[PDB]
């Protein structure tokens, strides 16, 4: 009756792909999940307390940040992405050297234990996120007609350097780089379910000529 509106964030990782179309990392929730089984989405999830702590050690600020919680939510998005697909995006040290390697299976497994695992892994290394590599592209609150509600902050970043996503555990049954047009058609046709914000991001990416133009202009309006 008095539904929690859960703060969350999602990361839309893109690259310039085949046929001059943008490609994006998507994941699919396993049929065994209790909430939204089989839904396609981008990596993301609920805010954790260590997210704002890591944001205070971060470099820079998200492009098109408008609110005081944008740095913490950018971190939420980056953390959830590392847990889901095994890559830590936008990491650097004090000298500006970028991390460009994936997490080993064991480090991804350790990050999925939750708590302050990511904050600890970064702080043992003197590393932090460069939030300047993310663009705030939207904010969506689930309609009050829904029994489970989120207030989700969407960020965009470019992953032209990334290899393949790697899963940990059973929550997701698939993860891949897909042209945004391909995925959109599959949702519009009814083949795969997706929440409204997911569709609206895919349509924005399809209208966009390339990843540089997206990092300069992308915005999802309700």
Cβ distance to Ca ion smaller for residue 17 or 87: 87
Q: Determine whether the annotation assigns residue 84 to a binding site.
A: yes
C-beta of 171: minimal distance to Ca ion in Å?
7
Interface with Ca ion (CB under 5 A): 45, 80
Q: Which two tokens stand for residue 115?
A: 């708590």
Q: Which two tokens stand for residue 212?
A: 């540089």
C-beta of 49: minimal distance to Ca ion in Å?
16
C-beta of 216: minimal distance to Ca ion in Å?
28
**3 state SS of 120:** helix
Tell me the β-bridge partners of 176: 26
Tell me the β-bridge partners of 114: none
Q: Are 178 and 119 in contact (CB under 8 A)?
A: no
Beta strands 149-158; 5-16: pairing state: parallel
* Secondary structure element (H or E) that encloses residue 71, with its range: helix 70-85
Cβ distance to Ca ion smaller for residue 65 or 175: 175
Q: Determine whether the annotation assigns residue 114 to a binding site.
A: no
C-beta of 134: minimal distance to Ca ion in Å?
17
Cβ distance to Ca ion smaller for residue 70 or 80: 80
Residue nearest to Ca ion (CB): 45
Q: Which two tokens stand for residue 220?
A: 């999802």
Q: Annotated binding site for Ca(2+): which residue ranges?
A: 44, 80, 84
């Amino acid at each position: 009756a008095m539904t929690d509106i859960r703060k969350a964030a999602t990361l839309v990782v893109i690259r310039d792909g085949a046929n001059k179309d943008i490609e994006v990392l998507v994941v699919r929730r396993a049929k065994t999940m209790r909430f939204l089984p089989g839904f396609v989405a981008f990596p993301g999830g609920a805010a954790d307390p260590s997210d704002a702590e890591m944001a205070k050690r971060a470099f820079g600020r998200p492009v098109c940040a408008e609110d005081d919680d944008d740095p913490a939510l950018a971190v939420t998005a980056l953390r959830e992405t590392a847990e889901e697909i095994g890559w830590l995006l936008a990491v650097r040290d004090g000298e500006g050297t970028k991390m460009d390697t994936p997490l080993a299976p064991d480090e991804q497994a350790d990050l999925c234990k939750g708590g302050d695992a990511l904050s600890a892994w970064l702080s043992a290394r003197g590393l932090a996120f460069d939030l300047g590599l993310l663009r705030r592209i939207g904010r969506f609150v689930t309609p009050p007609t829904q029994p489970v509600r989120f207030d989700t902050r969407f960020f965009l970043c470019v992953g032209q350097h990334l290899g393949e996503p790697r899963l940990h555990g059973a929550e997701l049954d698939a993860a891949l780089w897909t042209p945004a047009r391909d995925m959109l058609t599959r949702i519009q046709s009814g083949e795969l379910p997706a929440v409204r914000p997911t569709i609206a991001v895919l349509k924005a990416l399809v209208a966009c000529p390339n990843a540089e133009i997206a990092m300069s202009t992308l915005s999802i309006g309700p």
